[PDB]
TrEMBL record, chain A:
Protein name: TcdA1
Region of the whole protein represented: 147 to 629 of 2516
Organism per entry: Photorhabdus luminescens
Span of domain TcdA1 receptor binding: 173-278
Automatic annotation (TrEMBL), chain C:
Residues of the full protein shown: 921 to 1017 of 2516
Gene source species: Photorhabdus luminescens
Gene behind this protein: tcdA
Domain ABC toxin N-terminal: 19-97
Name the UniProt record assigns to this protein: TcdA1
Amino acid sequence: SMALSQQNMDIELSTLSLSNELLLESIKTESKLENYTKVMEMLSTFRPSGATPYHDAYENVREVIQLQDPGLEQLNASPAIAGLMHQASLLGINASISPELFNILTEEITEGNAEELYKKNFGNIEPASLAMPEYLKRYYNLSDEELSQFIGKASNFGQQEYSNNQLITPVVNSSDGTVKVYRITREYTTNAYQMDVELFPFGGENYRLDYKFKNFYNASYLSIKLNDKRELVRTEGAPQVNIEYSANITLNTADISQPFEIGLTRVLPSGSWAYAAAKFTVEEYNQYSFLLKLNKAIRLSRATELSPTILEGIVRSVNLQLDINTDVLGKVFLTKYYMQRYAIHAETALILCNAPISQRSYDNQPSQFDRLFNTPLLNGQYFSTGDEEIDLNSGSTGDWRKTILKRAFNIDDVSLFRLLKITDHDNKDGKIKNNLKNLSNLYIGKLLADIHQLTIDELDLLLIAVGEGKTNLSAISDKQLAT
Amino acid sequence: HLLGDKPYLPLSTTWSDPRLDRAADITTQTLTDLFLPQINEVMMNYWQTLAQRVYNLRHNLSIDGQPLYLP
Amino acid sequence: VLTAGLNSQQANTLHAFLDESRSAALSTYYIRQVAKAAAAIKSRDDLYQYLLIDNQVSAAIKTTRIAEAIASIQLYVNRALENVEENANSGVISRQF
Amino acid sequence: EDYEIPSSVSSRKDYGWGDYYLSMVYNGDIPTINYKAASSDLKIYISPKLRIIHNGYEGQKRNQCNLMNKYGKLAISPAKVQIIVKAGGKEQTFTADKDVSIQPSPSFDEMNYQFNALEIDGSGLNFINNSA
Amino acid sequence: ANRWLKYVWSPSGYIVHGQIQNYQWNVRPLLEDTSWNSDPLDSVDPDA
Amino acid sequence: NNNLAFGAGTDTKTSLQASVSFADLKIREDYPASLGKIRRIKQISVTLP
């Protein structure tokens, strides 16, 4: 039906736009829609089943308002107008989260609806194919390398979740590239109240066998055994109460396809022993292969441009693990705002969201705590364990750890003390309380000094000038901190 | 089309640091094969090569990545 | 309203962006929901081969409606001649053209 | 020899309900057809979708299904799900447990056995006035 | 060049005596044995 | 490979040597990869202010 007119010959059009016309006509035709406006406002906007629920008007606005170099600072520059919008609107523009994606991310995942939501977010795609990396890279247009970052979608990578007497986690076949979901069930059979046990996969037939004591017995040794016969964990000496212990063991399908028990035997110096045990079973389940949590991780990561290596810390450090909600996104958006607003590291932005400096190391990188306090390992290490109550007043002394704190915040003792007061204006004493909370808050007063051209003495002069004098970071909400 | 998808080729990070006398594990008349192969970039380069050639057509570049302004 | 306030020099980058993003979205939809089964389109690359138009090109490339009508036909013909397409008509392929 | 074979078929010549009328084969299709011809040979590839619905016979039998289907979960044996193809004078039988890569989840509303491709020997296809 | 390669391999297959064949490789030893040897030949000639 | 030293020859011990690694000059990076991979030296002249 194309006319052979002059205007189809001498007018330059972009490619893509011609392709978009073709797809829109094919798409409009199917589903019988009145116009391209329906194709876009209804079909494409609200179609989660596919790579994306694309909202054109949203992107039209987002891109132009981002072409406007201020990055919405011009609206902030005018509070009468900025205040007409929820902060989320502004944040929802700086991050590429369309209203439909927002709703997807904000709905909490209810396990009783794992299938029910699967059918909402996916078309009639059996998980059998959806779960394979061949399909996933296609469904999501991801690099197959990125799929390796999207691993360990559990409450932790280390100490994982437990509820209603079980564990639900993905296990990766390291050479195949595939992942399957397993349910590990744990029922108590003996005196679990004296000593517990947990079993986590880490690869096929590879398990982390963890244990914990509630009541001390003077064992000469501990022997943890499969069906009370095959030793799995050997521990010498009397083990301790409220200490988590672990070892890497092998339990093959012969050991785990049928119900089995792990004995926990506390062998005394005498011929007797005290014991605890739980019954375990490990099975692969299609019933848990929904990975709705993955769908979100992928969509969120691309909307935020936060690779899982930074993003998991952002979401797990601020809320309950294994889910995403509005509260989580708040922290994500805020983290991005500061990252976008100041020439700072994404971790810095997270701290400014009233987040602690984490002691957990991961992904071949030092823990956030170590990055600040042990990179300068001044012939020993600082641990934030409540013991090293180093005297931090002006005219004060201590060991190299005091020097570590001085170095960590790049300030002298007079300023370091003032910084304690900045966090806590009641902490006028000669010490650091030595925990992550106050160290993180010391870091925050310093960060406010790094993001603005302020000295430490000036941080207080300004708070007074403003009316924020005597603000305790030790008692500041994240909303107040952002404020 | 003929090549099909680029295969996923994971790398191993496991090594036993065996002693040489033990390493000298031989044939006659936890891997069985103590050592591992490399990728074979010659074959992998066919995808890398096509990917660039296609990239250039899609981005209006010449065979060597130079810009061009054809009518 | 917001779009309306741009200089043409800016409107042009807006379009380049929107056009590339939109096509990816429409293309994906097509593949999953409205593509016919007989044409076994698995990805945007096949979509190109079927609809005879490249939806992965940058917005920098310019054309005309006729230039795309030619080209899209030429591709069709080339695949027919090279037997990429399964059953081109014997009495048509032999035509002098 | 130019062969005009449609690339997709979705129509029916006949159909029916199960023995107890508590189900029927759903009006499904043959979404893809491909072929290769040669002097004195022909191969036709049928890539069918066999859909099963627990739709009973109209009347009290459909109503029994409505309850059977809504108040429980599916049964159907994939080994006996099959497609019988007859080309002219030759017959071939294919089953869902061999020619389907993914079996559908059990349900009563719909199960769809999507076959990969049935390779049909068309050399037994008998033409009358070039119609077969 | 295309035609000559087909004497060794045709991804689309071959027709023999009018019959549609079930193979792509037209060299018997390439058609047969579709697995990699687990034990490589210990040699210096890539041809061996 | 980027250092100064006296020689260790038998008649070069009193010679002063300076060295530079080509790899550390990052010459290749001055032009896009797409221009070609074979990048070889044609000539070297030395200026000693």
